[PDB]
């Protein structure tokens, strides 16, 4: 599925459907542009940067990953060792590695996708999906849910992810996609979308 002009590398199935939804409401048409969202099924991006980098197919691509408080430092040294020659990156600290990696379109999200979405403006639509998909939730759990809608700081993050993972991370994102709007888009996701869009448009411009 790689007759692609570009590739967006994501960790799992939630981003594989959330990121295309956010691209539409940002008017970045990924399919029209020939851009694939490819889930790497975890946090190892190195085989895929090898594949798309200069010593592979040399195809424009971006990375979207979580900070994980961090593991992201080694995760990004690994891809930077590929895309940046035999340059040494060992002497940089995590922050230095994160800001270097942005030049190549690799963006780090602090915290994690679904909680961030629930705090930052999608709380009430997520509760709605959760209840359509888990219709016989105990009343103790429905109330904890409403406790977080009323106040996205009362959030039990582990339970939220427990429910979503029970629904299915891909399936839950597919059902929340109709709800995303431009102003609730996380910044790292907008940065990756713009970076891959720029690189494709810069090619057409010569
Ligand atoms: Mg992660």
Numbering used by the authors: 390 to 458, 464 to 600
Sentences reproduced from the published study:
Overcoming lysogenization defect (OLD) proteins constitute a family of uncharacterized nucleases present in bacteria, archaea, and some viruses. These enzymes contain an N-terminal ATPase domain and a C-terminal Toprim domain common amongst replication, recombination, and repair proteins. Here we identify and define two classes of OLD proteins based on differences in gene neighborhood and amino acid sequence conservation and present the crystal structures of the catalytic C-terminal regions from the Burkholderia pseudomallei and Xanthamonas campestris p.v. campestris Class 2 OLD proteins at 2.24 Å and 1.86 Å resolution respectively. The structures reveal a two-domain architecture containing a Toprim domain with altered architecture and a unique helical domain.
The truncated XccCTR construct, in contrast, yielded crystals that routinely diffracted beyond 2 Å and three independent structures were solved using SAD datasets from platinum, mercury, and iodide derivatives. These models show strong agreement with an overall RMSD of 0.42–0.44 Å and display only slight deviations at the N-terminus near the mercury-binding site and within a flexible loop containing two adjacent glycines (G479 and G480). Residues 374–387 and 458–463 are disordered in each structure, though present in the purified construct. The XccCTR derivative structures contain nothing in their active sites. Similar interactions are observed between the domains in the XccCTR. The position of these helices is consistent between the BpCTR and XccCTR structures, arguing it is an intrinsic topological feature and not simply due to crystal packing. In contrast, truncated constructs containing the C-terminal region of each homolog (XccCTR, BpCTR) were each monomeric by SEC-MALS analysis. XccFL and XccCTR similarly can degrade DNA with Mg2+and Mn2+ but also are partially active in Zn2+.
